[PDB]
Design a protein around this motif. Structure first.
Motif, PDB file in Angstrom:
ATOM      1  N   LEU A  58       0.720  -1.037  -0.046  1.00 11.84           N
ATOM      2  CA  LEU A  58      -0.088   0.049   0.147  1.00 11.84           C
ATOM      3  C   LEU A  58       0.996   1.193  -0.155  1.00 11.84           C
ATOM      4  CD1 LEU A  58      -2.786   1.330   0.227  1.00 11.84           C
ATOM      5  CD2 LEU A  58      -2.525   1.138   2.856  1.00 11.84           C
ATOM      6  N   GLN A  59       1.036   1.854  -1.117  1.00 13.35           N
ATOM      7  CA  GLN A  59       1.862   3.077  -1.175  1.00 13.35           C
ATOM      8  C   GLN A  59       1.250   4.349  -0.831  1.00 13.35           C
ATOM      9  OE1 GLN A  59       3.085   3.806  -5.344  1.00 13.35           O
ATOM     10  NE2 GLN A  59       4.497   5.421  -4.662  1.00 13.35           N
ATOM     11  N   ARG A  60       0.072   4.551  -0.864  1.00 10.52           N
ATOM     12  CA  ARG A  60      -0.683   5.704  -0.209  1.00 10.52           C
ATOM     13  C   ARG A  60      -2.173   5.486  -0.199  1.00 10.52           C
ATOM     14  NH1 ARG A  60      -0.352  12.123  -2.131  1.00 10.52           N
ATOM     15  NH2 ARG A  60      -1.687  10.948  -3.659  1.00 10.52           N
ATOM     16  N   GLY A  61      -2.627   5.722   1.158  1.00 15.03           N
ATOM     17  CA  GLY A  61      -4.071   5.766   1.384  1.00 15.03           C
ATOM     18  C   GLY A  61      -4.690   7.034   1.777  1.00 15.03           C
ATOM     19  N   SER A  62      -5.527   7.664   1.053  1.00 18.46           N
ATOM     20  CA  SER A  62      -5.960   9.051   1.213  1.00 18.46           C
ATOM     21  C   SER A  62      -7.426   8.952   1.396  1.00 18.46           C
ATOM     22  CB  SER A  62      -5.773   9.844  -0.007  1.00 18.46           C
ATOM     23  OG  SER A  62      -4.503   9.951  -0.559  1.00 18.46           O
ATOM     24  N   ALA A  63      -8.109   9.806   2.366  1.00 16.13           N
ATOM     25  CA  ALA A  63      -9.444   9.843   2.691  1.00 16.13           C
ATOM     26  C   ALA A  63     -10.454  10.988   2.186  1.00 16.13           C
ATOM     27  CB  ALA A  63      -9.515  10.263   4.019  1.00 16.13           C
ATOM     28  N   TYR A  64     -11.506  10.876   1.710  1.00 13.75           N
ATOM     29  CA  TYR A  64     -12.455  11.698   1.102  1.00 13.75           C
ATOM     30  C   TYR A  64     -13.723  11.873   1.605  1.00 13.75           C
ATOM     31  CZ  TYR A  64      -8.797  11.740  -2.391  1.00 13.75           C
ATOM     32  OH  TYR A  64      -7.492  11.909  -3.070  1.00 13.75           O
ATOM     33  N   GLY A  65     -14.247  13.030   1.387  1.00 19.79           N
ATOM     34  CA  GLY A  65     -15.767  13.180   1.885  1.00 19.79           C
ATOM     35  C   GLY A  65     -15.776  12.994   3.108  1.00 19.79           C
ATOM     36  N   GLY A  66     -16.850  12.120   3.507  1.00 20.87           N
ATOM     37  CA  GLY A  66     -17.337  12.061   4.947  1.00 20.87           C
ATOM     38  C   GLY A  66     -16.156  11.230   5.704  1.00 20.87           C
ATOM     39  N   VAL A  67     -15.582  10.574   5.295  1.00 20.62           N
ATOM     40  CA  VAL A  67     -14.367   9.905   5.886  1.00 20.62           C
ATOM     41  C   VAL A  67     -13.405  10.896   6.384  1.00 20.62           C
ATOM     42  CG1 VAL A  67     -12.446   8.075   5.964  1.00 20.62           C
ATOM     43  CG2 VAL A  67     -14.681   7.585   5.173  1.00 20.62           C
ATOM     44  N   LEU A  68     -12.875  11.775   5.267  1.00 16.56           N
ATOM     45  CA  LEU A  68     -12.012  12.812   5.729  1.00 16.56           C
ATOM     46  C   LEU A  68     -12.391  13.583   6.651  1.00 16.56           C
ATOM     47  CD1 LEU A  68      -9.411  14.322   4.891  1.00 16.56           C
ATOM     48  CD2 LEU A  68     -10.629  15.450   3.075  1.00 16.56           C
ATOM     49  N   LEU A 129      -6.865   4.233  -2.665  1.00 14.64           N
ATOM     50  CA  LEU A 129      -5.759   3.388  -2.133  1.00 14.64           C
ATOM     51  C   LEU A 129      -4.855   3.175  -3.321  1.00 14.64           C
ATOM     52  CD1 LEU A 129      -7.948   1.103   0.086  1.00 14.64           C
ATOM     53  CD2 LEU A 129      -6.833   3.115   0.835  1.00 14.64           C
ATOM     54  N   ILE A 130      -3.666   3.171  -3.189  1.00 15.84           N
ATOM     55  CA  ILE A 130      -2.817   2.881  -4.200  1.00 15.84           C
ATOM     56  C   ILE A 130      -1.942   1.648  -3.935  1.00 15.84           C
ATOM     57  CG2 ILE A 130      -0.572   3.795  -5.642  1.00 15.84           C
ATOM     58  CD1 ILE A 130      -1.678   6.490  -5.092  1.00 15.84           C
ATOM     59  N   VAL A 145      -4.704   1.771  -8.700  1.00 19.21           N
ATOM     60  CA  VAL A 145      -5.272   2.941  -8.043  1.00 19.21           C
ATOM     61  C   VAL A 145      -6.775   2.554  -7.684  1.00 19.21           C
ATOM     62  CG1 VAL A 145      -5.831   5.295  -7.904  1.00 19.21           C
ATOM     63  CG2 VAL A 145      -3.716   4.653  -9.030  1.00 19.21           C
ATOM     64  N   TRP A 146      -7.307   2.413  -6.477  1.00 14.00           N
ATOM     65  CA  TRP A 146      -8.324   1.778  -6.239  1.00 14.00           C
ATOM     66  C   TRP A 146      -9.178   3.120  -5.475  1.00 14.00           C
ATOM     67  CZ3 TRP A 146      -8.929  -2.611  -8.374  1.00 14.00           C
ATOM     68  CH2 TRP A 146      -7.697  -3.352  -8.514  1.00 14.00           C
ATOM     69  N   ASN A 147     -10.190   3.284  -6.123  1.00 13.80           N
ATOM     70  CA  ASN A 147     -11.079   4.354  -5.719  1.00 13.80           C
ATOM     71  C   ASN A 147     -12.393   3.918  -5.154  1.00 13.80           C
ATOM     72  OD1 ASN A 147      -9.633   6.749  -7.513  1.00 13.80           O
ATOM     73  ND2 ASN A 147     -10.314   5.127  -9.121  1.00 13.80           N
ATOM     74  N   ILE A 148     -12.469   4.142  -3.770  1.00 11.48           N
ATOM     75  CA  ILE A 148     -13.279   3.361  -2.900  1.00 11.48           C
ATOM     76  C   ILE A 148     -14.507   4.444  -2.729  1.00 11.48           C
ATOM     77  CG2 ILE A 148     -13.557   2.114  -0.823  1.00 11.48           C
ATOM     78  CD1 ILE A 148     -11.327   1.133  -2.747  1.00 11.48           C
ATOM     79  N   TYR A 149     -15.933   3.799  -2.977  1.00 11.44           N
ATOM     80  CA  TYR A 149     -17.080   4.483  -2.888  1.00 11.44           C
ATOM     81  C   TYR A 149     -18.017   3.760  -1.882  1.00 11.44           C
ATOM     82  CZ  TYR A 149     -15.853   7.208  -6.955  1.00 11.44           C
ATOM     83  OH  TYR A 149     -15.018   8.005  -7.968  1.00 11.44           O
ATOM     84  N   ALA A 150     -18.710   4.501  -0.865  1.00 13.33           N
ATOM     85  CA  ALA A 150     -19.726   3.940  -0.158  1.00 13.33           C
ATOM     86  C   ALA A 150     -21.064   3.424  -1.033  1.00 13.33           C
ATOM     87  CB  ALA A 150     -19.959   5.004   0.878  1.00 13.33           C
ATOM     88  N   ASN A 151     -21.453   2.388  -0.776  1.00 20.21           N
ATOM     89  CA  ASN A 151     -22.930   1.907  -1.337  1.00 20.21           C
ATOM     90  C   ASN A 151     -24.044   2.680  -0.567  1.00 20.21           C
ATOM     91  OD1 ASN A 151     -22.034   0.744  -3.611  1.00 20.21           O
ATOM     92  ND2 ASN A 151     -22.041  -1.134  -2.730  1.00 20.21           N
ATOM     93  N   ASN A 152     -23.800   3.020   0.597  1.00 19.82           N
ATOM     94  CA  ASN A 152     -24.857   3.320   1.465  1.00 19.82           C
ATOM     95  C   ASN A 152     -24.470   4.359   2.457  1.00 19.82           C
ATOM     96  OD1 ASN A 152     -23.672   0.842   2.407  1.00 19.82           O
ATOM     97  ND2 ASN A 152     -24.424   1.738   4.468  1.00 19.82           N
ATOM     98  N   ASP A 153     -25.447   5.072   2.934  1.00 22.21           N
ATOM     99  CA  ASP A 153     -25.179   5.926   4.074  1.00 22.21           C
ATOM    100  C   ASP A 153     -24.754   5.280   5.376  1.00 22.21           C
ATOM    101  OD1 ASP A 153     -26.743   7.929   2.788  1.00 22.21           O
ATOM    102  OD2 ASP A 153     -28.328   8.262   3.919  1.00 22.21           O
ATOM    103  N   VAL A 154     -23.915   5.846   5.991  1.00 22.80           N
ATOM    104  CA  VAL A 154     -23.395   5.591   7.583  1.00 22.80           C
ATOM    105  C   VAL A 154     -24.089   6.835   8.350  1.00 22.80           C
ATOM    106  CG1 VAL A 154     -21.413   4.762   8.917  1.00 22.80           C
ATOM    107  CG2 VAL A 154     -21.457   4.087   6.563  1.00 22.80           C
TER     108      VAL A 154
END
Ligand SMILES: O=[N+]([O-])c1ccc2c(ccn2-c2ccc(O[C@H]3O[C@H](CO)[C@@H](O)[C@H](O)[C@@H]3O)cc2)c1
Length: 158
Positions: A58-68, A129-130, A145-154
């Motif tokens: 795992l080279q770099r993992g970055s947070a976005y949106g509500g996780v960030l 996630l790279i 490069v893996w762009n991770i999307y939420a399928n549902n609200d948390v």
């Protein structure tokens, strides 16, 4: 070396990018962890294990949106945990078989003290996630490069 996803997409030899859609626990309490297990999402293999050993980080993992905005926590990579968003590259996992093998990455995300209500929106990008792949054979150094999307609200209860 190539990879595939639980949503039926792929990234071939040489790397590239794909989207991953994850079902998330609908409720996460302050003081508890939301688990985002990518080992049920991302799978890779070695294309010539007779002679080549593949190395994967795992080279770099970055947070976005509500996780960030609403979470902190860690990433567990092959049995050891590190801060997430990441601050270094992880050690390498060996891929030495043509048989699909999960990429052993999971996020453990806990709500920040200010979080409440819908903390992650359905459909939103939560992480990038790279995966870096090298080998013991040539000088290949490829990013998957893996762009991770939420399928549902948390929701984080008040
Ligand atoms: O010693 N021989 O006789 C010998 C050696 C190599 C050979 C063959 C026949 C095919 N290959 C070969 C196959 C794939 C390959 O690179 C891809 O797959 C590697 C393993 O997953 C990976 O490290 C590379 O980055 C690239 O994704 C490189 C070479 C014969």
């Amino acid at each position: 070396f190539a990879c595939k996803t639980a949503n039926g997409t792929a990234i071939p030899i040489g790397g590239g990018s794909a989207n991953v859609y994850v079902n998330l626990a609908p409720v996460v309490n302050v003081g508890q962890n939301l688990v985002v297990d990518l080992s049920t999402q991302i799978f890779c293999h070695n294309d010539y294990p007779e002679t080549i050993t593949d190395y994967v980080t795992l080279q770099r993992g970055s947070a976005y949106g509500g996780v960030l905005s609403n979470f902190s926590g860690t990433v567990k990579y092959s049995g050891s945990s590190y801060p997430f968003p990441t601050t270094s590259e992880t050690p390498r996992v060996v891929y030495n078989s043509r048989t699909d093998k999960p990429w052993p990455v999971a996020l453990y995300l806990t709500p920040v003290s200010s979080a409440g209500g819908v903390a992650i929106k359905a459909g939103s990008l939560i992480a990038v996630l790279i995966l870096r792949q090298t080998n013991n054979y040539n000088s290949d150094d490829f990013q998957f490069v893996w762009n991770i999307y939420a399928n549902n609200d948390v929701v984080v209860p008040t």
